[PDB]
Amino acid sequence: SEELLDLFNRQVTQEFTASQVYLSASIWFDQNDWEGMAAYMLAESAEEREHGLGFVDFANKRNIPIELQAVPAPVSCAEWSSPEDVWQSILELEQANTRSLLNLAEAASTCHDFAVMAFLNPFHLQQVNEEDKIGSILAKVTDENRTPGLLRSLDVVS
Amino acid sequence: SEELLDLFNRQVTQEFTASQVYLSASIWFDQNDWEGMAAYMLAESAEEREHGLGFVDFANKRNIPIELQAVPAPVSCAEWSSPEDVWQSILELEQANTRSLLNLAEAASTCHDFAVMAFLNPFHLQQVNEEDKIGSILAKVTDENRTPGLLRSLDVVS
Amino acid sequence: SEELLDLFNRQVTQEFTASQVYLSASIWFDQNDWEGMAAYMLAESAEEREHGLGFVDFANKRNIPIELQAVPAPVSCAEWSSPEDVWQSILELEQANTRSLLNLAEAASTCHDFAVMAFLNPFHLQQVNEEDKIGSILAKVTDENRTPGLLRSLDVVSF
Amino acid sequence: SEELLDLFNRQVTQEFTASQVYLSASIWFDQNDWEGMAAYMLAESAEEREHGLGFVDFANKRNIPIELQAVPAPVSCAEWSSPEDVWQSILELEQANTRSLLNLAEAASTCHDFAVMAFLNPFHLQQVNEEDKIGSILAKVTDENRTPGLLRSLDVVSF
Amino acid sequence: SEELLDLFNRQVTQEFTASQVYLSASIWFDQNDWEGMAAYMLAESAEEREHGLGFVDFANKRNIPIELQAVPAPVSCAEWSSPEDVWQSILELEQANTRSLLNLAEAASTCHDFAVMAFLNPFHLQQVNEEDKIGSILAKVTDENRTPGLLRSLDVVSF
Amino acid sequence: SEELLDLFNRQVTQEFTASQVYLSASIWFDQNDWEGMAAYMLAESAEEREHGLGFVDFANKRNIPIELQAVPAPVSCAEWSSPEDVWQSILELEQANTRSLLNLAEAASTCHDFAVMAFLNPFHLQQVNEEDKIGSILAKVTDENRTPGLLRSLDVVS
Ligand SMILES: [Fe+3]
Ligand SMILES: [Fe+3]
Ligand SMILES: [Fe+3]
Ligand SMILES: [Fe+3]
Ligand SMILES: [Fe+3]
Ligand SMILES: [Fe+3]
Ligand SMILES: [Fe+3]
Ligand SMILES: [Fe+3]
Ligand SMILES: [Fe+3]
Ligand SMILES: [Fe+3]
Ligand SMILES: [Fe+3]
Ligand SMILES: [Fe+3]
Ligand SMILES: [Fe+3]
Ligand SMILES: [Fe+3]
Ligand SMILES: [Fe+3]
Ligand SMILES: [Fe+3]
Ligand SMILES: [Fe+3]
Ligand SMILES: [Fe+3]
Ligand SMILES: [Fe+3]
Ligand SMILES: [Fe+3]
Ligand SMILES: [Fe+3]
Ligand SMILES: [Fe+3]
Numbered sequence: 001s002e003e004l005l006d007l008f009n010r011q012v013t014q015e016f017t018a019s020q021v022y023l024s025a026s027i028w029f030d031q032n033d034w035e036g037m038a039a040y041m042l043a044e045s046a047e048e049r050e051h052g053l054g055f056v057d058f059a060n061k062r063n064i065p066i067e068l069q070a071v072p073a074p075v076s077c078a079e080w081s082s083p084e085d086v087w088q089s090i091l092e093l094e095q096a097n098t099r100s101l102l103n104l105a106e107a108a109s110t111c112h113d114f115a116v117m118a119f120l121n122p123f124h125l126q127q128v129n130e131e132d133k134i135g136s137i138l139a140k141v142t143d144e145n146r147t148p149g150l151l152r153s154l155d156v157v158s
Numbered sequence: 159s160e161e162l163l164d165l166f167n168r169q170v171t172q173e174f175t176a177s178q179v180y181l182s183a184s185i186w187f188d189q190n191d192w193e194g195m196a197a198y199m200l201a202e203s204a205e206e207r208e209h210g211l212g213f214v215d216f217a218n219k220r221n222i223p224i225e226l227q228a229v230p231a232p233v234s235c236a237e238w239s240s241p242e243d244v245w246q247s248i249l250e251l252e253q254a255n256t257r258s259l260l261n262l263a264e265a266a267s268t269c270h271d272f273a274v275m276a277f278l279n280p281f282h283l284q285q286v287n288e289e290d291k292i293g294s295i296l297a298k299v300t301d302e303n304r305t306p307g308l309l310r311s312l313d314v315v316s
Numbered sequence: 317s318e319e320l321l322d323l324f325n326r327q328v329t330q331e332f333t334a335s336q337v338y339l340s341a342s343i344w345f346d347q348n349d350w351e352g353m354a355a356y357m358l359a360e361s362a363e364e365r366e367h368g369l370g371f372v373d374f375a376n377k378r379n380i381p382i383e384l385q386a387v388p389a390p391v392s393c394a395e396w397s398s399p400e401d402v403w404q405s406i407l408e409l410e411q412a413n414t415r416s417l418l419n420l421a422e423a424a425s426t427c428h429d430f431a432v433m434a435f436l437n438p439f440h441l442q443q444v445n446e447e448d449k450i451g452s453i454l455a456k457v458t459d460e461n462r463t464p465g466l467l468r469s470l471d472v473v474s475f
Numbered sequence: 476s477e478e479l480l481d482l483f484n485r486q487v488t489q490e491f492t493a494s495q496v497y498l499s500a501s502i503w504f505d506q507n508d509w510e511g512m513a514a515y516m517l518a519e520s521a522e523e524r525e526h527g528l529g530f531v532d533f534a535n536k537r538n539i540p541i542e543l544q545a546v547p548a549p550v551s552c553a554e555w556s557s558p559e560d561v562w563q564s565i566l567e568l569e570q571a572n573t574r575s576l577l578n579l580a581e582a583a584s585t586c587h588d589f590a591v592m593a594f595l596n597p598f599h600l601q602q603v604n605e606e607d608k609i610g611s612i613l614a615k616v617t618d619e620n621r622t623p624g625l626l627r628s629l630d631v632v633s634f
Numbered sequence: 635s636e637e638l639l640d641l642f643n644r645q646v647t648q649e650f651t652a653s654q655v656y657l658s659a660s661i662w663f664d665q666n667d668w669e670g671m672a673a674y675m676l677a678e679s680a681e682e683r684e685h686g687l688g689f690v691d692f693a694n695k696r697n698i699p700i701e702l703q704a705v706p707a708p709v710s711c712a713e714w715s716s717p718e719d720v721w722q723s724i725l726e727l728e729q730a731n732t733r734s735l736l737n738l739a740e741a742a743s744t745c746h747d748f749a750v751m752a753f754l755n756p757f758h759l760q761q762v763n764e765e766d767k768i769g770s771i772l773a774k775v776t777d778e779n780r781t782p783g784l785l786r787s788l789d790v791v792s793f
Numbered sequence: 794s795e796e797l798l799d800l801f802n803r804q805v806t807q808e809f810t811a812s813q814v815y816l817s818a819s820i821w822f823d824q825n826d827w828e829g830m831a832a833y834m835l836a837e838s839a840e841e842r843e844h845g846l847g848f849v850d851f852a853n854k855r856n857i858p859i860e861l862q863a864v865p866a867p868v869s870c871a872e873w874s875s876p877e878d879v880w881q882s883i884l885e886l887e888q889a890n891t892r893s894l895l896n897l898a899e900a901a902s903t904c905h906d907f908a909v910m911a912f913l914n915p916f917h918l919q920q921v922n923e924e925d926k927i928g929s930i931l932a933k934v935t936d937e938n939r940t941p942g943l944l945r946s947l948d949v950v951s
Binding site for chain 3: 610611614615618619620621622625626628629632633
């Protein structure tokens with residue numbers, strides 16, 4: 001349960017970290033005139049923060065102490081030079097989100113914390129949906145960027 | 159305040175001059191079967207004239223003498239051979255608009271003309287928005303035009 | 317014909333020239349506290365501009381090359397000292413608009429340009445209405461201004 | 476700065492002073508059977524008071540101490556014998572309102588009080604509109620009063 | 635100017651930092667069963683974030699480079715033992731927010747960045763309103779806490 | 794009737810004087826974070842001015858010469874150190890209002906000015922209502938202030 005409490009706290013930090021990485025992606029896309037991709041990243045930035053807020057709320061109700069940690073500066077953004085790079089980082093971000101939730105769930109299972117397991121169930125399912133959606137967009141971006149200018153049409157229309 | 163009155167009068171001319179350049183761009187686009195880009199230019203031509211009329215109305219209220227100058231014929235059209243050339247000239251036009259507004263604000267600031275500075279505030283913010291939008295369209299135009307026919311396909315879906 | 321093309325192109329200039337003369341009239345009226353007359357002129361300024369855009373749009377469709385000319389400074393304001401002077405210049409301006417359209421239609425007739433003649437028909441009729449309306453306003457202004465202050469009383473009530 | 480605080484506090488007095496001068500104008504107009512002009516003045520009296528309350532409310536929020544001063548007796552009525560005299564005093568009053576606001580904004584600028592400058596922006600623009608409107612009414616009144624009875628005819632129709 | 639750009643970038647960090655301090659206040663309140671005060675702090679956490687996004691959006695449009703900085707761990711919460719302590723840190727936070735906006739506007743003034751000054755105007759006015767509201771809540775919290783249990787009684791009704 | 798015309802003119806001044814004292818109370822309350830009491834005072838400041846305007850309108854109709862006097866600066870604010878002090882001064886203000894209306898009615902009665910007495914009737918009844926309301930608020934304020942913080946709790950619920 002000490003491990004559970006420590007991981008629950010780190011999960012807040014993870015959600016807020018992810019929020020900031022999505023924000024840096026939104027900024028990179030806007031700077032490079034990919035306004036449609038930027039709006040998607042901005043929406044996820046708000047949603048990851050809300051996820052973090054949901055964990056905080058559950059923890060307060062369940063007497064899991066929360067100590068808010070620094071949210072580190074997002075760093076992958078230094079390296080991005082095409083939309084494909086940005087989507088690839090976002091995929092890895094969500095894969096790491098998924099792994100941290102599964103690790104938290106396994107800590108909860110070990111100490112028979114059925115309430116935490118129940119709380120995590122809709123998050124496990126949303127991660128399935130999200131990794132699928134991001135993986136698909138990444139495939140489409142990679143394919144369309146094979147012809148000069150063509151990826152600009154993904155952004156403008158969809 | 160002489161400088162302020164002079165610059166305020168020149169700003170009207172600048173707005174009507176830009177309205178004419180936008181009309182020239184709309185004609186070039188229509189002649190070359192870019193009806194969607196032509197519609198955008200025609201809307202901006204009307205907006206610029208409305209801005210000129212706004213300055214005229216304020217000047218009349220505040221007793222800033224207005225002497226309507228000739229609106230010079232647009233010339234940049236003679237060098238346009240692709241939509242990228244046209245959008246680049248429109249970007250330069252809006253950048254010149256922005257600079258003329260900043261110089262006018264500075265002349266107002268110098269003679270403590272708070273009412274003129276207050277009047278200009280929404281125009282300064284509008285120019286921020288417009289330069290961003292124009293700069294973004296130009297980047298998309300330049301990229302899409304890397305593939306024969308692709309730019310055409312995205313005039314039509316707009 | 318080359319002549320119809322030139323005149324069609326000049327017609328755009330005439331409509332924008334008229335738009336600017338109307339704006340100049342609105343400014344004189346506003347500066348001199350005739351806000352009702354000023355509103356009328358501002359409405360016409362917008363409408364003349366709309367007429368010019370209608371000509372441009374037809375030209376683009378019909379492959380009549382358009383080259384936008386300078387829109388001259390409106391200079392009639394130099395001799396405006398009363399509302400009657402302004403309305404007289406406005407009458408002359410609409411008389412010139414009408415003549416310009418008639419000359420254009422004559423060039424179209426000479427080269428059998430039935431589409432241009434058909435396009436101009438509603439504008440010929442509008443000019444009839446407009447010259448009549450401006451001529452009547454000028455008569456009213458001229459008459460009311462025979463008594464001090466009376467013309468003011470009717471900028472306020474009307475327009 | 477101490478100067479911005481003093482001027483901000485004086486601005487409340489100026490708005491209430493103006494409110495009372497407008498009420499005095501409404502009374503002169505009512506006593507002399509210009510009920511249309513009187514209504515206009517009464518509307519402005521209420522509005523100037525509302526402007527003063529807006530300044531007080533901002534001051535309270537921003538911890539600018541307000542000490543309410545005497546609102547002087549409006550004395551311009553002593554030389555009012557025609558509507559033109561009243562409108563001329565009203566023009567001068569709004570010209571003073573504008574100067575007062577500009578002096579305030581200058582003190583705010585000098586001490587980098589961006590919040591006070593931002594607060595004043597809509598009032599600077601309102602003063603532009605108001606000076607223009609009063610200047611125009613004064614011109615109309617002055618012109619119509621050149622013919623006996625004519626100005627009356629336009630208190631009734633308008634205002 | 636490059637400096638103004640740095641101060642603009644740091645204002646984003648300032649807003650996100652404030653967001654997290656408001657979140658830490660919400661947590662302390664919830665942990666101590668002050669759910670009403672907690673909800674208020676959560677609302678401000680969202681709003682401070684929204685302000686930071688507004689700055690980011692303006693910067694992207696105006697080509698002001700945005701580099702997202704670390705958001706430091708909130709530390710004041712280690713020291714809070716009563717709602718009065720928390721409200722006092724929140725007041726200092728907003729006072730700090732106000733000072734940093736004024737310093738940014740001053741940098742903008744120095745380099746004639748009229749667009750930046752215009753953008754900031756609503757935020758200056760919002761800080762005036764917010765400091766007033768927080769200052770007032772703190773004063774009520776301080777007063778009500780003089781009687782055991784009374785403060786509780788007004789987390790429950792108000793908030 | 795000289796006395797009546799004099800008192801009628803002094804009544805306008807009294808109403809505007811009370812409007813200013815109410816504004817002063819609203820400022821003291823706002824400065825001391827009693828926003829609910831401040832709102833009440835601000836509403837009364839507007840009402841008193843409306844009463845003054847009512848007297849002005851009647852006077853103009855009935856040809857009672859009106860000469861607008863200075864509206865003196867409120868001074869009672871200098872001695873206010875708690876809400877009870879403020880409410881006590883407002884009670885005294887309304888009591889003075891009532892007395893000035895009664896004296897004016899008496900002067901009207903003496904010169905048989907039935908129209909002025911009829912005009913005053915709803916104001917006499919309004920003052921009855923207002924003195925009762927103010928007297929009642931003062932009693933509640935005085936009682937609630939016996940316990941630290943308790944008065945504050947009841948400004949907020951109003
Ligand atoms: Fe999502
Ligand atoms: Fe989602
Ligand atoms: Fe996500
Ligand atoms: Fe635009
Ligand atoms: Fe626009
Ligand atoms: Fe534009
Ligand atoms: Fe017309
Ligand atoms: Fe016409
Ligand atoms: Fe028409
Ligand atoms: Fe007004
Ligand atoms: Fe006014
Ligand atoms: Fe108004
Ligand atoms: Fe730097
Ligand atoms: Fe930098
Ligand atoms: Fe740096
Ligand atoms: Fe807020
Ligand atoms: Fe807010
Ligand atoms: Fe805030
Ligand atoms: Fe850096
Ligand atoms: Fe009342
Ligand atoms: Fe009442
Ligand atoms: Fe009362």
